[PDB]
Amino acid sequence: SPVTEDLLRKGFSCVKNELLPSHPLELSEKNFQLNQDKMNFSTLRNIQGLFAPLKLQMEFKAVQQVQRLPFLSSSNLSLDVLRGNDETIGFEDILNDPSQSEVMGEPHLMVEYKLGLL
Amino acid sequence: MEYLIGIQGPDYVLVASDRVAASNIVQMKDDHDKMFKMSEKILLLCVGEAGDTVQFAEYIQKNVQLYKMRNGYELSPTAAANFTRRNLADCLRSRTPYHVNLLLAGYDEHEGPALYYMDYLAALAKAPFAAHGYGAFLTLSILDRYYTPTISRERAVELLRKCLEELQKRFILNLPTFSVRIIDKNGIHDLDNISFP
Amino acid sequence: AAVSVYAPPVGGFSFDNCRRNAVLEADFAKRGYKLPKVRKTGTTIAGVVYKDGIVLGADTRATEGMVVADKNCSKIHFISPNIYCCGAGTAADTDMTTQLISSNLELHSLSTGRLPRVVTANRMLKQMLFRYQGYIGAALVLGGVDVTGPHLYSIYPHGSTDKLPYVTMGSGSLAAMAVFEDKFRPDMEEEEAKNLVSEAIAAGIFNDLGSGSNIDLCVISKNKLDFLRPYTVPNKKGTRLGRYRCEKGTTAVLTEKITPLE
Amino acid sequence: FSPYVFNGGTILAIAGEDFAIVASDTRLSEGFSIHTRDSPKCYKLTDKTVIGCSGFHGDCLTLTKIIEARLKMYKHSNNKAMTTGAIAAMLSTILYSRRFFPYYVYNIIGGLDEEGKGAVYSFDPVGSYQRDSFKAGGSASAMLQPLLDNQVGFKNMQNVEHVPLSLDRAMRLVKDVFISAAERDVYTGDALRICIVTKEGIREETVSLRKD
Amino acid sequence: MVTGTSVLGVKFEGGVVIAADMLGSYGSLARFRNISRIMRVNNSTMLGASGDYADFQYLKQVLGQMVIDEELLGDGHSYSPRAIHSWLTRAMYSRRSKMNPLWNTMVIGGYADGESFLGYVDMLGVAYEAPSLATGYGAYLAQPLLREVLEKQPVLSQTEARDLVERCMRVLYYRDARSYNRFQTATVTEKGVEIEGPLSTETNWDIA
Amino acid sequence: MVTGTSVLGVKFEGGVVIAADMLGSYGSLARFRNISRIMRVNNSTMLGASGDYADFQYLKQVLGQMVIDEELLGDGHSYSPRAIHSWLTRAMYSRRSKMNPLWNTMVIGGYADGESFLGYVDMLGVAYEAPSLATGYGAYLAQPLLREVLEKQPVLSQTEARDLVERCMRVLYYRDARSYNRFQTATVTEKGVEIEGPLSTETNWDIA
Amino acid sequence: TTIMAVQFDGGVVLGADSRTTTGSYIANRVTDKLTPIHDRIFCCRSGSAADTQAVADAVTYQLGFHSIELNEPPLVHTAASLFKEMCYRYREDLMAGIIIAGWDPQEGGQGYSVPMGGMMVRQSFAIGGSGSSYIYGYVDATYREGMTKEECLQFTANALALAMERDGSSGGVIRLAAIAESGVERQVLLGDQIPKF
Amino acid sequence: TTIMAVQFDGGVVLGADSRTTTGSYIANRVTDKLTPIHDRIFCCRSGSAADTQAVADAVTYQLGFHSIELNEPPLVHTAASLFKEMCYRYREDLMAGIIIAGWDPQEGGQGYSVPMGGMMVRQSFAIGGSGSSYIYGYVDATYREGMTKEECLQFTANALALAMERDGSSGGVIRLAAIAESGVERQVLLGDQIPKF
Amino acid sequence: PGIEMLHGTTTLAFKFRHGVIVAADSRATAGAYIASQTVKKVIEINPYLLGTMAGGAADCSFWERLLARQCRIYELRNKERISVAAASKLLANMVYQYKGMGLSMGTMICGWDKRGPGLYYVDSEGNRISGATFSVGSGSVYAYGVMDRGYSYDLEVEQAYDLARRAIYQATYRDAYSGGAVNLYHVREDGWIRVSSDNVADLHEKYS
Amino acid sequence: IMSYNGGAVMAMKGKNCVAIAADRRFGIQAQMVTTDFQKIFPMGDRLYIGLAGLATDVQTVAQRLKFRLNLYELKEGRQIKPYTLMSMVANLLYEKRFGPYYTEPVIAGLDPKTFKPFICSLDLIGCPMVTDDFVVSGTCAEQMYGMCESLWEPNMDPDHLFETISQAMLNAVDRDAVSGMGVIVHIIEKDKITTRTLKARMD
């Protein structure tokens, strides 16, 4: 820890160091929105009841699947006022803005991966 | 370790090599062609850490044929160099402590030949004659001394022969025989191997 | 475009250099080669709370080691119409981490129609700095008047906060804050406060190595915002005695190209 | 524990035609504070030889106090006075006597030869002398030297003649170079002491320099 | 590993004044609260030291022995403060070069031949004279006030010098981790050496 | 880093007895002197633990929650001590394999279906049963007496078992660095679980 | 950084010292090491200077939300449980020794301790801090039972002033505050008001 | 390992605890941590268990030789100076905190301290030991001036018994011994004779 | 302290039918800052031998001075000139006396004597290898190849001078520490004679 | 770490004229592999950038900056003001603040509307600062402030500006092992760009 049970499409990534975290501010930056949402969900589930996290997360799921196709930039106008970051500009949009992506994948491959078919 | 040199000229990108293998204290094989081929006009020399060299060269070689087969025409040496450097930098910095040296070649149809020198941190120069390995130290001065700005194809072989004789006489290791290939506006020509009895 | 991409790119602080950086540093540490350095501008910052408003001030030297990189670098930024901050150490980080909060407070003020309150800036700065546990160092001195009254804060590079009536942060600060400890009295006047802070910053600038050149003050009184720069020049460079200018033809030349633009 | 610490300083020496000049800033600074502002770093040895000793200020005193004693011993023994051509070798021997516990100093020797002639020597912490003509050095080095290289011995200049250095030019150059180099360095400044020496004795000189 | 706080001192018109804290710190705890740190080596030179205390005792014994031997001999000559300063510098440097350092930092003050002397003898072999001085952690807080007042006025009298030392004690007690309410002082005017103490420092915490 | 002392126990003719010290040590200082270390998870099983205390609180909450949920469901079935022992073993092993160990060492005793059970659940994934047991530093001092008496006589009664535990407390208080005069005890006979305490240990220092 | 609490009949007292520092140098001469969570429960601090603040903010958030949700005054046991659950879960980089106390309508008067490591327990008198190890004997030998507000205040003043002088971390003014059945009253002891010994 | 001494008019008292150990395990339950050097001066011990013994033996040797050479009873200052000179000279591997006290015909009644590092000084009450840091406040707040033998003995018993229970290193019997103008008398407090708190 | 001097340099010496030729550069670096431009490295010890310089500076100078003193003493005693082999072995013994403490030196003692020429080599390692073609220092390579390609043992004088100049220039053009001036030394029956000194810029201009 | 390669760049503001100069050398530590390796990039027309440091990151940062500059120029219509590129490079460098690059860029150019000369500088991770008289950064940073401070003068015509930028480099860069063997001088006057190549010691 998985065995094999196309290398040109995905290659040149040794197994050595993905199970070896980089500079300690790695798991607190690669996964930040997920961790903040998890903490808020746990707090609400503990103090307010079991209805609020279920309702809010299923609202997230409902609003998530109306954006443009993955191979184009997503405006994400909605889901933002609902998340609570409506005006909380920070080190997430001014640095390496995804609109000007330096590298871009194939459309069919990206959409079929987003669907999870692969 | 190993040895790679390439001399420029008016219409050729002549490169030598060192057909040899490596191990702990043993020579597994005495003829191992290091010269991967890119297209009908481009070579790619590569010496580095074992395994990573033959993997990176294979990956970067089954990517230039795709461009030709998908667009009809062929790449240019400058584009090939600026693509190989980018791939090497992105992959080396990503997750792998690589150690590979490269020496591109090639002859386009607009500006003479072109020879590119690249270290293991993914730099890109355009020296008229470069070298790799450890023999670079003992042979680069010899290459620089006699290198007239214009050299005939006949004299290039003689200069290479002298530069390899000096290395074979004053070096610790036992590089027994070398390979020679010269590129012109006719494909990838070949010459008889250089073997020292 | 590319043929080896699956997921869309994600913004934020990139990290695709540390793997190479560590091995390169290990290679270059034992070989006695040059080492990278940043503008660790250890500077004195002073602030006092007089009867009406607040007075700020800091020195204007920006070193990057043992060499004086700059002789005029503003250590006072803009956050809101009636809130000012100060930086200390690693000016590169402090500039961005103050500008971000300035923009956030501007958005809040535009959405509210009323002047912001200092406690909001304190809360946001504390939250951000504690989120980035260490690895980013910018000692700040946050001061500003609001609808309630004068305020002052002493944010540390780990998230601590205080509400002192006077504070001095930076590399060379003990001299200035000792001058404060000796001369300060409660409920002073405006000109007296300005003279006191000028004297403290002068003591700090003289009795230290990390500070020098001009000083400035940032009086932010209730109905008048002032920004004096420079305020006083303590040291003036002398004059060059002999002319050492070189005339035409002094230097040689090998090749030359001339291209006319439009 | 660490039996070493820095104290700054700067030494400059111009060896003209019949005059040697040694000058040095005066500020004892360690860590980030300042200890004093007088701290002269130009001690006299004989009537025609001046020693400038930069570096760590715990051996700059010991070498100064040892050289004078050895000079007195030599004068008593051989019934003469050491010339500037022997002090170099003698100090080199003393410095190399502790190659396994090196002295942390950067010494500069200036004086007159047997005949009226400029001469400035230069050492290294381990100890190896070498004759020079305009050598400087110390803590804030690498800034003083290039300007002197541009001025004293005309280098990388063409269609310009050669003129011997006049005494009026030397002080005017030294003051200008120290004033220019005091701003951009941290350890320099405060007071400047000049020890111009000629064939009539030693005369001092003190000027202000970026008052701090 | 008992440690001192600060042995600062300032020059003066015909005399020198030295102050020190009667404290001993066992790392962080305040183990001892009555030990003294000022000496009376002879009739014209006094002494003060910081850092370790056992080494201060040892040099106290050695230097008192030397001065009493010299006085007992009898020639109409004594030890000028410059000689004592040079001896301490040489001893400290020799101990440093042998890899057995004395963790100490001292101040030597005196008044001989109608002039004042004050020096610094830091353990790494540092020696000089100055119109004012501070030791240990006081080199950042105690020095600036004295330097400013001395630059404004290079010559003083007894009243303002005493009040300046009092103010410096006030600020140092305010803002130091190792300090005590009481402290000693001793002038070295031409009458002799007069050790005075203990003293007190009235404070104000009205900004609480 | 609060730490316990010893949670030793011995089997018995129809029942089990467990004793422990009401102490909490902050490395060397005795920070707390009234905390308890015995549990009453259900009507037929008891518990004791040593080592860290916060982890003991956490497992107390978790196991009490599990048992109260099972009782609240309602099926005429309970948790036999073997199942609880297996659950603790699995939890400890899973925590060990994740590089987040629980610095704890527990004893599980009970009496179900007319037989006694006693186990050891050491944090490294060690589990077994024995007629007698000791924890922590008692594995060298507390064990030998119980082992000797059990080998001489494999079955006992209540009086001699109680006196044996009393003697073991006496010796352990005599010769351990972390101990207290008072200690708790609790039998698990078929009537129920009866927590008793505090107790006392009369000593004799006549060989002083 | 000495912190201690004492419980009496009908209420509790609470003291502290304001000498937050950064090593051998004093950071702030006078501070408020006494946070008023909600309106009755009070929470002192120790250990570091940022993790404690973050924990206090989170506790204020959650406890205020809970109290306004149930439309009832909070119970101190809820605050103790919240502190325990927050501290223990993050027992790797959250070195923050905390002591909380307060009054509630039911069984008024409570003193809780929660040292580093997340352990929670109740005791009549709680003491915590780096300079809070020199008064154990005095507090054990002097603390009797059956004391009202005045002598409890005097005892706290004396006990804290004793360690106020025999340490380097402590020093300065004293911040006695007593929470009772009716409300909260605060006072500061400065100058000669501090008992000598 | 708590050691303390107190001086009164006409003599001094001296106590100790017998719980010498080797870590988490008790080495000896009852010992005599009180060595009778000569016939009046008494010397307690702390720190290690062998360097202290060697130092005590050397002190006994030299002091007995000196006393029999001068044909006069010894002075405690001589013992203090000898201990200081022996300890300070070997301040590299002689970690042995020592406290000495005794009576002499001239200015009878002396309590001297000499902690690790060789420093020597006199004080009215001396306290030393690893478990001798929990009673500083109590001894400072309780020790008045002008007390005779009985209340001094009671005070020493109480003060030592307080730390006797709030530590792991201490525990067991108590070894009060009082040296006076006439002679030396010793007694041991065991069982309930030890005051509770 | 800081790096002493001369992190690396270059030099060469070959022998043929008319004696031994010595060439050297002059750049005593200090890690990353050029300290001097005209430091002489061909050390003269008497008008029969020619000491060389490499590695460290102070160590090389001191050991050549000691070798010169010993050679002069032997000359005065035995009335006969000392052979090159004796001096080489003497220096080898002195340098090998201290090893592992950080010594670093490369010297190529050469000259004429009763047996003809001789160019023995010694360094800090301790070997005393002879030869007919040598080059030491950082810039020894980049010159080794050229000077091995050109050497023929039947050259004239001017041809040998040109070969040495070309070798040094081509070595210093490609390296990063050699350069400055070029000193050329000749050895014959009547002792060494200085040939000429030259600047790199002029050679580059005339070889372009 | 800025010693695995070499480089040195200046910038002087004269009288409606700005000058930028560099040094041409690329070598792996002691060894040297080439003499021609450009370190001056023609971003815009009357604007230039002066990357100097580790080359393998110089190429990457130059490529990314050129890409983003083309994007902004095409989207927003008209040319880029010199002050904008300052914040451009600041953002680009702070993108990888934790995984820092190795570049000390220098920007020098003219305002396309006002023709008022502008010069700035940057540190390793991005800290904007502007100096009126001159600025310099590179591997040999220490041995240029002394040469530049005295020789400088305000209100200089193009000829004297070229002479000063030549004299502050040609005999001030040879005092170091690495970063030598060739100097390129770029003078940017009001109407026409001009490039010159000096000659220095070949060592």
Would you say I128 and I96 are in contact if contact means Cβ atoms under 8 Å apart?
no
Q: Reduced to 3 states, what is the DSSP secondary structure of residue I185?
A: strand
CB contact under 8 A, D32 and C172: yes
Of D37, C159, I163, nearest to G54 by C-alpha is: C159
Would you say B92 and C20 are in contact if contact means Cβ atoms under 8 Å apart?
yes
Indicate contact of I with E: 3+ CB pairs under 8 A.
no
Order of strands, edge to edge, in the sheet holding I193-199?
Answer: I133-135, I11-16, I19-24, I181-186, I193-199
Q: Which residue numbers in chain F precede an interruption (C–N > 2.5 Å)?
A: none
How many residues are present in chain E? 208
The Cα of G77 is separated from the nearest Cα of chain H by a number of Å equal to 28
- Tokens read off for E180: 């005590």
Would you say G166 and G134 are in contact if contact means Cβ atoms under 8 Å apart?
yes
Q: One-letter amino acid identity for F70? A: E
Query: How many angstroms separate the Cα of A24 from the Cα of each of C135, F51, I22?
Result: 10, 31, 58
Query: Is the CB of residue G197 less than 8 Å away from at least one CB of chain E?
Result: no
- Tokens read off for B35: 């010269």
Q: Compute φ and ψ for B102, nearest 5 degrees.
A: -130, 155
Would you say H154 and G152 are in contact if contact means Cβ atoms under 8 Å apart?
no
**Greatest pairwise CA separation for chain I in angstroms:** 54
Q: Are strands E132-133 and E9-10 parallel, antiparallel or unpaired?
A: antiparallel
Q: Can you tell me the distance from the alpha carbon of H168 to that of H177, in angstroms, rounded to the nearest whole number? A: 24
- Tokens read off for H42: 């008494």
Q: Can you tell me the distance from the alpha carbon of G43 to that of G23, in angstroms, rounded to the nearest whole number? A: 24
Percent helix, strand, coil in chain I, to 5, is 35, 20, 45
Would you say E81 and E129 are in contact if contact means Cβ atoms under 8 Å apart?
no
Q: Can you tell me the distance from the alpha carbon of J16 to that of J189, in angstroms, rounded to the nearest whole number? A: 7
Q: Are strands D43-46 and J8-13 parallel, antiparallel or unpaired?
A: unpaired
Q: Which residue numbers in chain H precede an interruption (C–N > 2.5 Å)?
A: none
Q: Radius of gyration of chain G from Cα atoms? A: 16
Q: Can you tell me the distance from the alpha carbon of E12 to that of E131, in angstroms, rounded to the nearest whole number? A: 8
CB contact under 8 A, F208 and H18: yes
Would you say E117 and E129 are in contact if contact means Cβ atoms under 8 Å apart?
yes
Query: Is the CB of residue E32 less than 8 Å away from at least one CB of chain H?
Result: yes
The beta-strand segments (E) located in E54-94 are: none
The Cα of E12 is separated from the nearest Cα of chain D by a number of Å equal to 17
Neighbour-count burial of F99, counting CB atoms closer than 10 A to its CB (0-12 exposed, 13-18 middle, 19+ buried): exposed
- Tokens read off for I152: 């023929």
Indicate contact of H with J: 3+ CB pairs under 8 A.
no
Is the bond into J154 cis (omega within 30 degrees of 0)?
no
Judging contacts by C-beta atoms under 8 Å, the chain C residues touching residue A90 are: 100, 104, 128
Q: Radius of gyration of chain J from Cα atoms? A: 16
How would DSSP label each residue in C146-195? -SS---EE---TTS-----SEEEESSS-HHHHHHHHHH--SS--HHHHHH
- Tokens read off for C239: 């004059």
Q: One-letter amino acid identity for E184? A: Q
In a 13 Å sphere around the CA of H43, the CA atoms on its Cβ side amount to 25
Order of strands, edge to edge, in the sheet holding G42-43?
Answer: G42-43, G98-102, G110-114, G121-122
- Tokens read off for C95: 């500039």
Pick from C130, C162, C163: CB nearest G54 = C130
Chain F nearest-CA residue for G134? F29
The Cα of H56 is separated from the nearest Cα of chain F by a number of Å equal to 23
Q: Can you tell me the distance from the alpha carbon of E183 to that of E19, in angstroms, rounded to the nearest whole number? A: 7
Q: Can you tell me the distance from the alpha carbon of F172 to that of F141, in angstroms, rounded to the nearest whole number? A: 7
Structure determined via: cryo-EM
Q: Which residue numbers in chain C precede an interruption (C–N > 2.5 Å)?
A: none
Of C191, C218, C168, C213, nearest to C46 by C-alpha is: C168
Would you say B189 and B182 are in contact if contact means Cβ atoms under 8 Å apart?
yes
| Chain D / chain J CB contacts < 8 angstroms | 44
Give the orientation angle of helix J142-151 with respect to helix J158-170, to 10 degrees. Answer: 150
The beta-strand segments (E) located in chain D are: 10-15, 20-26, 28-30, 33-36, 43-46, 49-55, 105-112, 118-122, 137-138, 190-194, 197-198, 201-202, 205-209
Query: How many angstroms separate the Cα of F99 from the Cα of each of F92, F103, G92, G119?
Result: 11, 12, 13, 21
- DSSP H or E segment with residue F69: helix F54-73
Q: Can you tell me the distance from the alpha carbon of J138 to that of C64, in angstroms, rounded to the nearest whole number? A: 13
Q: Is I57 annotated as a binding residue?
A: yes
Count the Cβ atoms, other than its own, within 10 Å of residue F14.
13
Judging contacts by C-beta atoms under 8 Å, the chain A residues touching residue J68 are: 100
Of J160, J172, J198, nearest to J14 by C-alpha is: J160
Q: Can you tell me the distance from the alpha carbon of D89 to that of D109, in angstroms, rounded to the nearest whole number? A: 11
Count the Cβ atoms, other than its own, within 10 Å of residue D133.
16
Chain centroid to Cα F97, Å, comes to 25
Would you say I182 and I198 are in contact if contact means Cβ atoms under 8 Å apart?
yes
Provide CB contacts within 8 A for E146, sequence distance 6+.
E8, E10, E132, E134, E164, E168
Would you say E96 and E144 are in contact if contact means Cβ atoms under 8 Å apart?
no
- Tokens read off for A7: 């290398």
Judging contacts by C-beta atoms under 8 Å, the chain B residues touching residue J59 are: 85, 123-124
Provide CB contacts within 8 A for I71, sequence distance 6+.
I45, I46, I49, I82, I87
Query: How many angstroms separate the Cα of F193 from the Cα of each of D37, F16, F43, F44, F129?
Result: 83, 10, 6, 7, 21
- ∠ CA(C109), CA(C114), CA(C119), 5° rounding? 70
Q: Can you tell me the distance from the alpha carbon of J173 to that of J150, in angstroms, rounded to the nearest whole number? A: 16
Q: Which of residues 98-117 of H touch F (CB under 8 A)?
A: none
Task: Fill in the DSSP letter of residue E99.
Answer: T
Handedness of CA H25, G130, G177, G152 (dihedral sign): positive
Pick from J4, J34, J59: CB nearest B127 = J34
- DSSP H or E segment with residue J84: helix J82-94
Would you say I107 and I128 are in contact if contact means Cβ atoms under 8 Å apart?
no
Count the Cβ atoms, other than its own, within 10 Å of residue D151.
19
Query: How many angstroms separate the Cα of I150 from the Cα of each of C160, D143, I14, I147, I155?
Result: 74, 43, 11, 5, 10
Is the bond into E198 cis (omega within 30 degrees of 0)?
yes
CB contact under 8 A, G50 and C162: no
How would DSSP label each residue in A22-61? -SSSSTTTSSSHHHHHHHHHHHHHHHT-SHHHHHHHHHHH
Residue of C251, C253, C259 best to disrupt the J interface, most CBs of J under 10 A: C251
Of C167, C200, C163, C160, nearest to C183 by C-alpha is: C200
CB contact under 8 A, A8 and C3: yes
Q: Can you tell me the distance from the alpha carbon of H127 to that of H97, in angstroms, rounded to the nearest whole number? A: 11
Provide CB contacts within 8 A for D95, sequence distance 6+.
D63, D103, D105, D107, D123, D125, D126, D127
Neighbour-count burial of I44, counting CB atoms closer than 10 A to its CB (0-12 exposed, 13-18 middle, 19+ buried): middle
Subunits next to G (3 or more Cβ pairs <8 Å) are A, C, E, F, H
CB contact under 8 A, E144 and C175: yes
The structural domains of chain B, with segments of one domain joined by +, span 1-196
Q: Compute φ and ψ for C194, nearest 5 degrees.
A: -65, -45
Query: How many angstroms separate the Cα of H39 from the Cα of each of E29, H68, J52?
Result: 35, 13, 83
Q: Can you tell me the distance from the alpha carbon of D154 to that of I37, in angstroms, rounded to the nearest whole number? A: 15
Instruction: Look up tokens 């002039």; give the residue.
Output: E115
Long-range pairs of B48-51 with CB within 8 A, sequence gap ≥ 24 = B48/B98, B48/B99, B48/B100, B48/B101, B48/B120, B49/B98, B49/B99, B49/B100, B50/B22
Q: Can you tell me the distance from the alpha carbon of H114 to that of H44, in angstroms, rounded to the nearest whole number? A: 11
Task: Fill in the DSSP letter of residue I82.
Answer: P
Taking the C-alpha atoms of A75, A80, A83 and A85 in order, what is their torsion angle to the nearest 10 degrees? 120
Would you say F28 and H1 are in contact if contact means Cβ atoms under 8 Å apart?
no
Q: Reduced to 3 states, what is the DSSP secondary structure of residue I145?
A: helix
Instruction: Look up tokens 């149809």; give the residue.
Output: B109
Judging contacts by C-beta atoms under 8 Å, the chain H residues touching residue E53 are: 117, 119
Across B15-52, b (16+ Cβ under 10 Å) vs e yields: bbbbbbeeeeeeeeeeeeebbbebbebbbbbbbbeeeb
Instruction: Look up tokens 């079935």; give the residue.
Output: F77
Resolution to 1 decimal place, in Å: 3.9
Chain centroid to Cα B73, Å, comes to 24
Residue of F31, F37, F98 best to disrupt the G interface, most CBs of G under 10 A: F31
How would DSSP label each residue in D98-156? TTTS---EEEEEEEE-SSS-EEEEE--SS-----BSS--EETT-SSHHHHHHHHTS--S
- Tokens read off for A114: 């987003």
Neighbour-count burial of J9, counting CB atoms closer than 10 A to its CB (0-12 exposed, 13-18 middle, 19+ buried): buried
Q: Reduced to 3 states, what is the DSSP secondary structure of residue B85?
A: helix
- ∠ CA(I124), CA(I126), CA(I128), 5° rounding? 115
Q: Radius of gyration of chain I from Cα atoms? A: 17
